[PDB]
């Protein structure tokens, strides 16, 4: 339609932002950036709707323009910067670090982490390719390219990114028995261990995940994120650890506070 | 202007498609370069994405590869002797991909004499190292007597501004010689 759009109408925004229906006609359209549009979380949404630190976009911009907020070690004074999965949002004033992880409901949960863990981040290897001059590189889920990766690092692996030098300290390989985060689809936000991987050459790789409750669910390879080994995640999991309780037991737990 | 859309160009059932969507810029075509020979004239075309194409009009010289020894000398194009798509391109000497042209062959002769020292067209032991595997072909070597080598244009002059190509050899040269002595 003659060019790229710049507005995001309300009721067209991603549902996991949990934006009010009647606050306005428009939602914050995420700027171009690391992760995505629908799979992202703008800094304005994170600061005004999740933390309630700001009351409107004007206060969000006032907070940003004094270099307080910081995404993956960089200031990111952009109001609609597309913060996404595994991104570390550190506030130096009121020093606290958040890791953008999905709760089991598929929303970006408010997840406090320590400084020693905000030092790094995890990135799913989107591709492995030889660059110019024959220099191999890996492309991660958040748009990072890291030169000279370990030759055993393949697609669907996970790499730990130093986030200060932007280098790979360690890497987890995709195979059965590894802890995985689900980053899309129906099972978004669930955590389990890889059981099996169906190939379907030419189609879409499928992977079966078994959570701690022995519940098994299938999902595409595009939305599984290796986050460590069974019972030992490389990142701190959110409050619920992605267990996917049914509505009945959720109501039981809610009523368990009498 | 020229349009590459399929909204015209009636469907496979033969039905005439009703018109919507007045011509779009992202489906435009442009005029052929119709490259000629001599007095190099390259016009830049601003293409989609801010990129640049080069309409070569009146090309004089091109880079032609022997491809049997890997030489790729720059040489003058004499004229067009054959074109598989249109005899009018041969008649008008239109430079175009896959056109069979004649090239000066002087740079290739000079390289051959400086490489093998083997009287092609009529520090020391490099020529001796270049052993009895120095005969090229009885049909390529005979063209050096007239000083004109048959070559095929491999670049697209209207797209890239260059008239590069390769010297015909083997079965390709035999095929094009058959066509040339049949139609001439």
């Amino acid at each position: 339609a003659r060019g790229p759009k710049k507005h995001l109408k309300r009721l067209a925004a991603p549902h996991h932002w949990l934006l009010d229906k009647l606050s306005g006609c428009y939602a914050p359209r995420p700027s171009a950036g690391p992760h995505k549009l629908r799979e992202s979380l703008p800094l304005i949404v994170f600061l005004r709707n999740r933390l309630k630190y700001a009351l409107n976009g004007r206060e969000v911009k006032a907070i940003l323009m004094q270099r307080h907020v910081k995404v993956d070690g960089k200031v990111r004074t952009d109001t609609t910067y597309p913060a996404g999965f595994m991104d570390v949002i550190t506030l130096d004033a009121t020093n606290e670090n958040f890791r953008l992880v999905y709760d089991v409901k598929g929303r970006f949960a408010v997840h406090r982490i320590t400084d020693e863990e905000a030092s790094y981040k995890l990135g799913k290897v989107k591709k492995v390719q030889l660059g110019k001059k024959g220099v191999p590189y890996v492309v991660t889920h958040d748009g990072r390219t890291i030169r000279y990766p370990d030759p055993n690092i393949k697609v669907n692996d996970t790499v730990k990114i130093d986030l200060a030098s932007g280098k790979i300290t360690d890497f987890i390989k995709f195979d059965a028995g590894k802890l995985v985060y689900v980053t899309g689809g129906r099972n978004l936000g669930r955590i389990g261990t890889i059981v099996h991987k169906e190939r379907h050459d030419g189609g879409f790789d499928l992977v079966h995940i078994k959570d701690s409750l022995d519940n098994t669910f299938v999902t595409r390879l595009n939305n599984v994120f290796v986050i460590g080994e069974q019972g030992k995640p490389y990142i701190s999991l959110p409050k619920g650890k992605g267990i996917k309780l049914s509505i009945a037991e959720e109501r039981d737990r809610r009523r368990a506070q009498q | 202007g020229i349009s590459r859309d399929s909204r015209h160009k009636r469907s496979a059932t033969g039905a005439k498609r009703a018109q919507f969507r007045k011509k779009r810029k992202f489906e435009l075509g442009r005029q052929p370069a119709n490259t000629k020979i001599g007095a190099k004239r390259i016009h830049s075309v601003r293409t989609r994405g801010g990129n640049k194409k080069y309409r070569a009009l009146r090309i004089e010289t091109g880079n032609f590869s022997w491809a049997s020894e890997g030489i790729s000398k720059k040489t003058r194009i004499a004229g067009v002797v054959y074109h598989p798509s249109n005899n009018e391109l041969v008649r008008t000497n239109t430079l175009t991909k896959a056109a069979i042209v004649q090239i000066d062959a002087t740079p290739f002769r000079q390289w051959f004499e400086a490489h093998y020292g083997q009287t092609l067209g009529k520090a020391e032991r490099k020529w001796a190292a270049r052993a009895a595997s120095a005969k090229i072909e009885s049909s390529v070597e005979s063209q050096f007597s007239a000083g004109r080598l048959y070559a095929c244009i491999s670049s697209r002059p209207g797209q890239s501004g260059r008239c590069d190509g390769y010297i015909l050899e083997g079965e390709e040269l035999a095929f094009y010689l058959r066509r040339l002595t049949a139609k001439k």
């Binding site: 220099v135 030169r147 000279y148 030759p151 | -």
Partner: protein, 223 residues
């Protein structure tokens, strides 16, 4: 008919009212830059050679440099031409401009005095206007004031005293392309950045080559 006559040397311009056809026929049939003589046009001018450069006709349409017509025509005008200012990037407009050939249509001609023949005009040499602004670029000031390259032009830039509240503070231009320690520091920083990046890439490549050799040797030792 009016004559917008200008003397570029030291600056001057004034408008004459030449209402006599007998004394104005000399400008006819001459397009641009011809040897129209002051003694040929009027008695006030003696020995003046006019550079006949432009004009406006009745209805105010300007003359275009190379139309070569006695009348006015509509031209599709572009960015870098006369008689049109594009209000938008890439905009072109079809505007009616008048030809270059001078004729009875013109309401005002514009003349440039290129040669001085006889007694001065009352708006030619007695009145002169100074150059409003001095040079800004450092080498431009050096060329204007005639000094050499290594002469440290930082002091005698043309200044101006503004007397508004009896403070009379000088106003000198910020001169550009100055050789400054800040600029030298920027250049040094750029060279250092390039060399540091090259060294970092070289050592990363060396470490990766070491890694590859280690893995290959391990594989061949594992058979």
């Amino acid at each position: 008919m009016k004559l917008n006559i200008s003397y570029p040397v030291n600056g001057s311009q004034k408008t004459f009212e030449i209402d006599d056809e007998h004394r104005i026929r000399v400008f006819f049939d001459k397009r641009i830059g011809q040897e129209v003589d002051g003694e040929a046009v009027g008695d006030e001018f003696k020995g003046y050679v006019f550079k006949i450069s432009g004009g406006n006709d009745k209805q105010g349409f300007p003359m275009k440099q190379g139309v070569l017509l006695p009348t006015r025509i509509k031209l599709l005008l572009t960015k870098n031409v006369s008689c049109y200012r594009p209000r938008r990037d890439g905009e072109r407009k079809r505007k009616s401009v008048r030809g270059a050939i001078v004729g009875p249509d013109l309401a005002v001609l514009a003349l440039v005095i290129v040669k001085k023949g006889e007694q001065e005009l009352e708006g030619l040499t007695d009145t002169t206007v100074p150059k409003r602004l001095g040079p800004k670029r450092a080498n431009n000031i050096r060329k204007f004031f005639g000094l050499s390259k290594e002469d440290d032009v930082r002091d005698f830039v043309i200044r101006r005293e503004v007397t508004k509240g009896e403070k009379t503070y000088t106003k000198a231009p910020k001169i550009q392309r100055l050789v400054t320690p800040q600029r030298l520091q920027r250049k040094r920083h750029q060279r250092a950045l390039k060399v540091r990046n090259a060294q970092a890439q070289r050592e990363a490549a060396a470490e990766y080559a070491q890694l590859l050799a280690k893995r290959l040797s391990e594989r061949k030792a594992e058979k």
